[PDB]
Design a protein around this ligand. Structure first.
Ligand code: CL
Ligand code: CL
Ligand code: MG
Ligand code: MG
Ligand code: MG
Ligand code: MG
Lengths: 244, 204, 241, 213, 125, 249, 243, 195, 231
């Protein structure tokens, strides 16, 4: 019957590894680099677009950075199509929580549930896993500013600064070197861009090949604002830090 | 036993010159017993306002439901929902429960941000849209409100004058209804500013 | 190489099972032809009865799908009948749901969409048949629409199907180059059938008796097949000119 | 009485109280019907067509609920069209069987008193009547509808087998004339449909003619 | 539904999928449990190749199942969350029907039962 | 019963999704199609590769209307495209119009189509769609827009682009000619020039299929009376209309 | 290659090798025939007597469908029974809805579509039987033969099994020598002879003859078994012809 | 019927609940506690249809305790009340609805404020300074309209509560066998043993 | 070889190997014999043990007061099929107040076994059965094989070395068929028949198993000291 054509996506190797999860991570390592840096007064999300064409519409485009709710955002690394399936689920889960408790969802709870969905695809169903790694950047009144990452295995961990996608080994070393705990948002913006500028496979880092976002408490008195940077705003912040 | 008149309450909406107004009473009761005098029946999602009369549990449930739906709308559309669109969303959602309906009398009010046109609309419990230039009424004193609005209303009222007309319509209607009153709130809505006023009314 | 066993892509972007389903089409070794008149649409096909023990009346590759639609198949009879039964059901359901007779081209699209599903879904194999639908549509007039195992379909001025399809095709192409029109300029369907048979004789290079052919004719409000004697009468007229 | 036939209808639905009949004769069969449709005492339609085609030469007379009979007749027409595509022309008996199957299996939810009439070449004219219960009864002629009660006496006394076309048309005309005269639920024009080897012929007769018979 | 028998016997009488799952446990960070006269202590390893971590929000290795029972683990981190969730639910369910919190043996028996069920159920590893 | 409840598309050791790559190879073989965005409109165009000269190429429509203000064209496997158009039209109603009483904006309809194509990449017992779509459309708040959709389910907005047989050369040609001040008529002119390079045989209104998303068309609406209803922005250019623009080429 | 390992898989020729492999199972089975006559049909079959311990007359292979259709088959006997069980359900639902007993052509397609359905998926095996069947309906007598592929046609005479070629040759002679027609009682006698002549291709074990028939005149349009004097009369006729 | 009251004061929430359980013409029990602790700083009293009341209360209690373990964090009284309301809002359109009315008294540790919520079996939630379910309200509401002040202490709240119970004991037809009083504040939940 | 992975696959010569491997399980099973006259039908079965400390595997199962069978091969599969027969016999009684015909019993088993040989996932039954019974048309003996083939016989035998008993019955056919109105003599003939399949071992008191059904005799099984008469 059909047994003949089954890849058996949810099994162990003799060494105790999940074949499909490992190969999905190999896929993700070729995707555009995404960096998250957490500061005391905000969070930065920076991401490199995959080899841009000059005729690509840049201003009305969304590839790397997505909004989950007013307090939480994610940076994507891997298959965009797969990420959007998970993003819409995460958006719905956040609204279910708000409907039930009349309170915005805590960041970890949203991350755990989204990570549990990925886990399910590695243990049962016979389907391929989602070829996606997220960087979650958000705020709540319990833990404040938070950075997480999840990968196709469904495992998630918290970070002060983290990179996903291509050249993470090189990127993580540079972040580990220059990062410190009493850092400000404006400094973290500069670190994120400098790190991408050195780890990039491109000749030079330009505004049209980037996506950028911040989560500050820079709004008026005790409230969080999400800023998804416009093309011109990236052009200005790139000149201001002396990269171009 | 009649879901629409256990808790009581009223909502009214009016248009003016480059503005709209929406007002409601504050009573929540259990038949004869008055229970709460802080129960507001008007909500808003962005710049679109929704008033809801009828069974209180459904008022609360529908507010939470349209907050849910308009939030997802905004994330996907990357813009705030407009009154004309929202009106259709309310109609769809109510008719989805055709044979097990929410016992409510909702009222939409707002100004379209693109065209600047004042907009109001009303519904029955299964989602029949009632569009109107002048005014929309809802609740246990709907008859009274229809009478007050028809006689007091005139077109193209200024925001300050419109406030007086809608407030007098609500107050005098509420005083002729046993299950409505116990306070009132009036929203005056201009293109890019919104004023909210609490009225002094008789507390019986 | 399991990519040649089920309907999934090969490295060069091909579906081999679909390609092999096309080769099953010619397994019967029968050629068909379809042309349009002014008021009618005529379809003809070869009839080969090798076994002497067969009841020749039951040997047929032409089907009456609805009152108005007729269908001729190139391919094995089990798959042919499978397609015929489904088309009959779909045509009947269409009339019940939408209050009017299913058009020839709409049915063709529906059967083509079904064929497409077999090329994408793994558990279902493609049918090894090519379905040629004919009618006189009340809106579009005389119509010929053809479906294949790939899920492809298109309308035709005229068409041919089978092993020696290309010879018949160019024979028809050369006629329409000469006549400068999209159809057979002829009043009665009788002479449109005579045209169809004549040009098949020229293309294939064989002569036909009454039992060597099978004919289907579509007119306004009815499609019907011709008996052996109806064809014999038609063959006499060709010989006497 | 007739009430428990009309007591079956759903509140407010269109009523097909009727004077319908089918009569076999020498050359085939003739179906006949009035044209009145009522909602209580208001005539919703005074020019209705209660004689409906389920196949070329298989027709039926409808009575009871307008909605139910229409829904049934549409399904039967669908079944017989699908039958014809696979097995060729169905018998009148086959058509009556499909009607029965729908009427019997849904006897609680339906109010449909149907007369089935058709012409075969082998079996000539045939008439099957299907009352409320969903039973089938093959007869030489059949009468049905609210107005039929008033013409049981007349039809039994006047019906003969192997009548001519003109005689059968007179028999149906005189009968339905009386049914219409006495039944308030029946009225309008008298439609008829003639089923023979020759083909299908539609006839109509207006009040000015049939009232003064 | 996906039905495939992934855990099956081999000629030598072994279930390789179960044994390969043990290799995943052998890869995981070390965990230790020592019980004294009036207490139990759970120790856990955390690998130090991960700097720039946020220890406030990073999932802890030891998890509370109820106010009186804890669970630590070694192996796949994502898998452990599913067992912990099921165990926490069963802990509340036991209080609800028996009007008494679970024993440590009972809670263990339940978790062990779940693990076993995944060794002879179709479509799962 | 369908026993294929498992994924036919899986990750290889190198991290490639084989079936998606092979589907993109099928798109490469397919006939060239392109799209160009102007200031006051959008144009989409393709070659009508006829299977036979006896075949009526008018009956086969490569450019399709999805909504009154949104149109689509493809490169790759025609049958796969056809069913996607059917599913795309229906989803525009079920998951949007029947809810909001209005047609969806381009980006969201594109998003729904992408979701369908993504599922064919992961669901049990199916292969990916062997097509790449170009979807042109207009809506009140976003204005004119042009999107590409790939077998993986990925979509990207474009100022102008081309897909299929001669896409590499066609994209280079468009980079030279495209500017942000292009009027609709200029974009149609450039589209025809770009397409002539990839076409080999006959080049006329009967062998070329071309549609636009431009101004509203009250005459094509079918009725009058409602002032707010002003007609479809999608219009398919006729055979004659194309030939007029080929003379002054 | 590997194209013959799974059902419903086309080979590069355009062939379904699994169906062709099922035909080999049919070719291995005992001989069975069908003869169309003036106003009906006759069926006959070879029953191999494996042992003295087999009870004579009490291992019936020919099966009736409804009251007017007879079915006989060669190959895997259980597969044939399964097919007849389906045929009986098909014939039952037809009569339930349409009142009239199922016509033979109508019945033939019901089986044809069912057998064809078993060449569409790899989760099922093709039928390991060729089935000869037919009867009398409103339009007269019909004889059919259905194969593992789902292919069927109308026949004047039909044969299948290990001695099919011998039987086919003998059938072709009857069609030539009797153009105006063959009678029902004659067809029974001929059926016996052809089975005996076809037994030459299976002559290790001796055999038992079994005949059935439908005829508008002789059986009143119903399916009956040939027994007693009429059976022995047909055996004696066959014995005289071989010698 | 059953008497359940609630009074929110400056720094605490006080819930009073009748002790009587009556079936037919017999008081089966006179020491019943009609409340469950949902979390260390959240208490829910209940009254309504027999069986349904305890089944519902314990079901909620289990769900809130499950949340506390999972997140190692206590849900706010506002969050708990919203969860409870939604469960009742689902219930009312079920095959067999929970006929239970509840009062949720809690102390929000983040806001440092006491909170009292009144929810009926339909899922009708209201935050109040004082609340009551059943026929009790017809006496206690007007009494509290007069005597209640927002800045009162816990001791003043208990005297205000005594005044309610006295009035109910005087004018109510049924003997409800006194009340069990519980206080919810910054230090958690405790019971007043002598009332 | 490549065509024996599952039951849904045909071999190039038209064989079903999974069905043939199921047939092989019967040959490994212990011998059992069946035979009948006109008045009575008899089952004789050689029971098998694991060792001297173990019991002897029961081979004969009762289906109704007038019917029962003996097994050879996978015993659990016989339990499934015998249970199905018990239900079918019982359905015939409750609904039609009718004792199930032995021929119909065979037809039902055939059709049940067949469905397992045409579908993916399942497997053929791994057991052969000998059904005996007495109905309205006298005594009957059937032989069931898991391919689906059921055959009515005067006598037969299945299991290991069954050819010896089958040859004996083929010689004795004319004798034992006429043993009418005499149970003990018909059993004796069956016990002598099964003895032709013995090697090294002989029939002992807890080894032999006999069953009988007839005209005025319900289906009854004899084991232990009750079969000492026939040694
Ligand atoms: Cl379709
Ligand atoms: Cl009507
Ligand atoms: Mg008042
Ligand atoms: Mg008052
Ligand atoms: Mg396939
Ligand atoms: Mg009248």
């Amino acid at each position: 019957g059909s047994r003949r054509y089954d890849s058996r996506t949810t099994i162990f190797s003799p060494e105790g590894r999940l074949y499909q999860v490992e190969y999905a991570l190999e896929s993700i390592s070729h995707a555009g680099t995404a960096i998250g840096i957490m500061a005391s007064d905000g969070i930065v999300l920076a991401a490199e677009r995959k080899v841009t064409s000059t005729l690509l519409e840049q201003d009305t485009s969304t590839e790397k950075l997505y909004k989950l709710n007013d307090k939480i955002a994610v940076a994507v690394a891997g298959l965009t199509a797969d990420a959007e399936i998970l993003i819409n689920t995460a958006r719905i889960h956040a609204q279910n929580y708000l409907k039930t408790y009349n309170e915005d969802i805590p960041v970890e709870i949203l991350v755990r549930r989204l990570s549990d969905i990925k886990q399910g695809y590695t243990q049962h169903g016979g389907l391929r896993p989602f070829g996606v790694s997220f960087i979650y950047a958000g705020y709540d009144d319990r833990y404040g500013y938070q950075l997480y990452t999840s990968n196709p295995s469904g495992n998630y961990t918290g970070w002060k600064a983290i990179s996903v996608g291509a050249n993470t080994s090189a990127a993580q070393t540079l972040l580990q070197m220059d990062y410190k705990d009493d850092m400000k948002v404006d400094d973290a913006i500069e670190l994120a861009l400098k790190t991408l500028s050195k780890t990039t496979d491109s000749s030079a880092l330009t505004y049209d090949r980037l996506e950028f976002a911040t989560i500050r408490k820079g709004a008026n008195d005790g409230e969080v604002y999400q800023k998804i940077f416009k093309p011109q705003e990236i052009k200005d912040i790139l000149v201001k830090t002396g990269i171009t | 036993s009649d879901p629409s008149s256990i808790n009581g309450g009223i909502v009214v909406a009016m248009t003016g010159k480059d503005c709209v107004a929406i007002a409601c009473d504050l009573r929540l009761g259990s038949q004869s017993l008055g229970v709460s005098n802080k129960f507001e029946k008007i909500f808003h999602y962005g710049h679109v306002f929704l008033g809801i009369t009828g069974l209180a549990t459904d008022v609360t449930t529908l507010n939470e439901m349209f907050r849910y739906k308009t939030n997802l709308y905004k994330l996907k559309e990357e813009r705030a929902i407009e009154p004309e669109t929202f009106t259709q969303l309310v109609s769809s959602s109510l008719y989805e429960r055709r044979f097990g309906p929410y016992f409510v009398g909702p009222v939409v009010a707002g100004i379209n941000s693109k065209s600047g046109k004042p907009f109001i609309a009303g519904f029955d419990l299964i989602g029949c849209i009632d569009e109107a230039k002048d005014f929309i009424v809802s609740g246990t004193a709907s008859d009274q409100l229809f009478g007050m609005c028809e006689s007091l209303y005139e077109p193209n009222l200024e925001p300050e004058d419109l406030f007086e007309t809608i407030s007098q319509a609500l107050l005098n209607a509420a005083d002729r209804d046993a299950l409505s009153g116990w306070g009132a709130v009036v929203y005056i809505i201009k293109k890019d500013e919104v004023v909210k006023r609490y009225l002094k009314m008789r507390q019986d | 190489g399991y990519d040649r066993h089920i309907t999934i892509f090969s490295p060069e972007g091909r579906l081999y099972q679909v390609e092999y389903a096309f080769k099953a089409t010619n397994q019967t070794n029968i050629n068909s032809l379809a042309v349009r008149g002014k008021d009618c649409t005529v379809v003809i096909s070869q009839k080969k009865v090798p076994d002497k023990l067969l009841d020749p009346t039951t040997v047929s590759y032409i089907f009456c799908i609805s009152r108005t639609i007729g269908m001729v198949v190139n391919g094995p009879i089990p798959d042919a009948r499978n397609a015929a039964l489904r088309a009959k059901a779909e045509a009947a359901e269409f009339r019940y749901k939408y209050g009017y007779d299913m058009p020839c081209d709409v049915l063709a699209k529906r059967m083509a969409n079904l064929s497409q599903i077999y090329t994408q879904r793994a558990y279902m194999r493609p049918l090894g048949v090519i379905l040629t639908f004919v009618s006189v549509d009340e809106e579009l007039g005389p119509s010929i629409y053809k479906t294949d195992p790939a899920g492809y379909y298109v309308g035709y001025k005229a068409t041919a199907t089978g092993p020696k399809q290309q010879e018949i095709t160019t024979n028809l192409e050369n006629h329409f180059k000469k006549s400068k029109i999209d159809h057979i300029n002829e009043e009665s369907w009788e002479k449109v059938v005579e045209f169809a048979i004549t040009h098949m004789i020229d293309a294939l290079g064989t002569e036909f008796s009454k039992n060597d052919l099978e004919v289907g004719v579509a007119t306004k409000d009815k499609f019907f097949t011709l008996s052996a004697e109806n064809i014999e009468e038609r063959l006499v007229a060709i010989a006497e000119q | 009485g007739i009430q428990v036939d009309i007591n079956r209808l759903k509140k407010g639905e269109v009523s097909l109280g009727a004077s319908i009949m089918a009569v076999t004769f020498k050359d085939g069969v003739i179906l006949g019907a009035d044209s009145r449709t009522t909602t209580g005492a208001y005539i919703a339609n005074r020019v209705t067509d209660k004689l409906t085609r389920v196949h070329d030469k298989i027709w039926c007379c409808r009575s009871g609920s307008a909605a139910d009979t229409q829904a049934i007749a549409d399904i039967v027409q669908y079944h017989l069209e699908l039958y014809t595509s696979q097995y060729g022309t169905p018998s009148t008996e086959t058509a009556a069987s499909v009607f029965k199957e729908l009427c019997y299996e849904n006897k609680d939810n339906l109010t449909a008193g149907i007369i089935v009439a058709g012409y075969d070449d082998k079996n000539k004219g045939e008439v099957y009547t299907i009352p409320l219960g969903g039973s089938v009864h093959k007869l030489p002629y059949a009468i049905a509808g609210s107005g039929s009660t008033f013409i049981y006496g007349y039809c039994d006394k006047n019906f003969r087998e192997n009548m001519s076309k003109e005689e059968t048309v007179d028999f149906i005309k005189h009968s339905l004339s009386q049914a219409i005269k006495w039944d308030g639920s029946s009225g309008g024009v008298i439609r008829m449909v003639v089923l023979t080897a020759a083909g299908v012929e539609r006839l109509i007769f207006y009040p000015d003619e049939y009232e003064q018979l | 539904g996906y039905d495939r028998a992934l855990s099956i016997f081999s000629p030598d009488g072994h279930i390789f999928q179960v044994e390969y799952a043990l290799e995943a446990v052998k890869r995981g960070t070390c965990a230790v449990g020592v019980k004294g006269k009036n207490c139990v202590v759970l120790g856990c390893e955390r690998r130090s190749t991960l700097k720039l971590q946020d220890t406030r929000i990073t999932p802890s290795k030891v998890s509370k199942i109820d106010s009186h029972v804890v669970l630590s683990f070694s192996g796949l981190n994502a898998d452990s969350r599913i067992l912990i969730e099921k165990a926490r639910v069963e802990a509340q369910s036991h209080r609800l029907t028996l009007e008494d919190p679970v024993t440590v043996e009972y809670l263990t028996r339940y978790v062990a039962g779940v693990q076993q069920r995944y060794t002879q159920s179709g479509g799962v590893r | 019963t369908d026993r294929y409840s498992f994924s036919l598309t899986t990750f290889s050791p190198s991290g490639k999704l084989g079936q998606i790559d092979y589907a993109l190879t099928a798109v490469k073989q397919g006939v060239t199609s392109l799209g160009i965005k102007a200031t006051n409109g959008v144009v989409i165009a393709t070659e009508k590769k006829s299977s036979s000269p006896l075949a009526m190429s008018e009956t086969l429509s490569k450019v399709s209307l999805l909504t009154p203000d949104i149109g689509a064209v493809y490169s790759g496997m025609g049958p796969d495209y056809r069913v996607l158009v059917d599913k795309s039209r229906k989803v525009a109603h079920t998951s949007y119009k029947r809810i909001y009483g209005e047609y969806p904006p381009t980006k969201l309809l594109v998003s729904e189509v992408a979701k369908i194509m993504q599922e064919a990449t992961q669901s049990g017992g199916v292969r990916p769609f062997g097509v790449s779509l170009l979807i042109a459309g207009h809506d009140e708040f976003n204005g004119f827009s042009l999107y590409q959709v790939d077998p993986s389910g990925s979509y990207f907005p474009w100022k102008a682009t081309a897909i299929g047989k001669g896409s590499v050369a066609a994209k280079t040609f468009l980079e030279k000619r495209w500017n942000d001040e292009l009027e609709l008529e200029d974009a149609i002119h450039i589209a025809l020039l770009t397409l002539k390079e990839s076409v080999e045989g006959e080049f006329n209104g009967d062998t070329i299929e071309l549609a636009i998303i431009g101004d509203e068309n009250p005459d094509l609406l079918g009725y009058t009376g409602i002032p707010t209803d002003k007609g479809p922005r999608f219009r398919k250019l006729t055979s004659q209309e194309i030939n007029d623009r080929l003379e002054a080429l | 290659t590997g194209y013959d390992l799974s059902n419903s898989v086309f080979s590069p020729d355009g062939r379904n090798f699994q169906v062709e492999y099922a035909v080999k199972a049919v070719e291995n089975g005992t001989t069975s025939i069908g003869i169309k006559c003036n106003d009906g049909v006759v069926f006959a079959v070879e029953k191999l007597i494996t042992s003295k311990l087999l009870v004579p007359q009490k291992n019936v292979k020919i099966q009736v469908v409804d009251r007017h259709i007879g079915c006989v088959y060669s190959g895997l006997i259980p597969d044939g029974r399964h097919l007849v069980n389906r045929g009986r359900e098909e014939a039952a639902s037809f009569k339930k809805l349409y009142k009239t007993p199922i016509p033979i052509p109508a019945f033939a397609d019901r089986l044809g579509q069912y057998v064809q359905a078993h060449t569409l998926y790899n989760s099922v095996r093709p039928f390991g039987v060729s089935t000869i069947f037919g009867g009398v309906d409103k339009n007269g007598a019909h004889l059919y033969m259905l194969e593992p592929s789902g292919s069927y046609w109308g026949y004047k005479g039909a044969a299948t099994g290990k001695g099919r070629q011998s039987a086919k040759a003998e059938l072709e002679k009857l069609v030539d020598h009797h153009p105006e027609g063959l009678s029902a009682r004659e067809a029974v006698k001929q059926a016996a002879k052809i089975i005996y002549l076809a037994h030459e291709d299976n002559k290790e074990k001796d055999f038992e003859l079994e005949i059935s028939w439908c005829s508008l005149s002789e059986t009143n349009g119903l399916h009956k078994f040939v027994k007693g004097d009429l059976l022995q009369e047909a055996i004696d006729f066959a014995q005289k012809e071989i010698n | 019927m059953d008497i359940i009251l609630g009074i929110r004061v400056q720094d605490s929430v006080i819930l009073a609940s009748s002790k009587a359980v009556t079936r037919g013409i017999s008081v089966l029990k006179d020491s019943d506690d009609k409340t469950r602790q949902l979390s260390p700083h959240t208490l829910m009293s209940f009254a309504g249809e027999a069986g349904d009341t305890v089944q519902f209360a314990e079901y909620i209690q289990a769900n809130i305790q499950l949340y506390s373990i999972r997140e190692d964090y206590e849900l706010s009284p506002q969050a708990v009340s919203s969860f409870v309301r939604q469960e009742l809002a689902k219930s009312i359109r079920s095959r067999r609805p929970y006929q239970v009315n509840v009062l949720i008294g809690g102390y929000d540790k983040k806001k440092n404020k006491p909170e009292l919520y009144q929810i009926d079996y339909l899922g009708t939630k209201v935050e109040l300074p004082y609340g009551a379910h059943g026929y009790s309200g017809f006496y206690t509401f007007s009494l509290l309209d007069h005597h209640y002040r927002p800045d009162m202490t816990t001791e003043e709240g208990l005297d205000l509560l005594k005044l309610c119970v006295q009035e109910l004991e005087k004018r109510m037809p049924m003997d409800f066998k006194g009340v069990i009083v519980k206080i919810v504040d910054k230090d958690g939940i405790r019971q007043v043993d002598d009332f | 070889n490549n065509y024996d992975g599952d039951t849904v696959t045909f071999s190039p010569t038209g064989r079903l190997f999974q069905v043939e491997y199921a047939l092989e399980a019967i040959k490994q099973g212990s011998v059992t014999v069946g035979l009948r006259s006109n008045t009575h039908a008899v089952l004789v079965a050689l029971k098998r043990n694991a060792d001297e400390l173990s019991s002897y595997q029961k081979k004969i199962i009762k289906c109704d007061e007038h019917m029962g069978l003996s097994l050879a091969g996978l015993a659990p599969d016989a339990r499934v099929l015998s249970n199905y027969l018990r239900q079918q016999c019982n359905y015939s009684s409750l609904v039609f107040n009718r004792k199930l015909a032995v021929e119909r019993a065979g037809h039902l088993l055939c059709d049940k076994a067949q469905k397992n040989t045409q579908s993916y996932g399942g497997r053929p039954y791994g057991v052969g059965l000998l059904i005996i019974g007495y109905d309205k048309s006298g005594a009957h003996l059937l032989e069931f094989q898991p391919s689906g083939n059921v055959t009515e016989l005067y006598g037969t035998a299945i299991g290991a070395r069954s050819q010896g008993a089958k040859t004996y019955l083929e010689r004795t056919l004319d004798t034992f068929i006429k043993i009418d109105g005499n149970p003990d003599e018909l059993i004796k003939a069956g016990v002598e028949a099964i003895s032709q399949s013995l090697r090294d071992e002989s029939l002992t008191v807890d080894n032999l198993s006999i069953a009988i059904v007839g005209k005025d005799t319900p289906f009854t099984i004899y084991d232990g000291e009750a079969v000492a008469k026939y040694i």
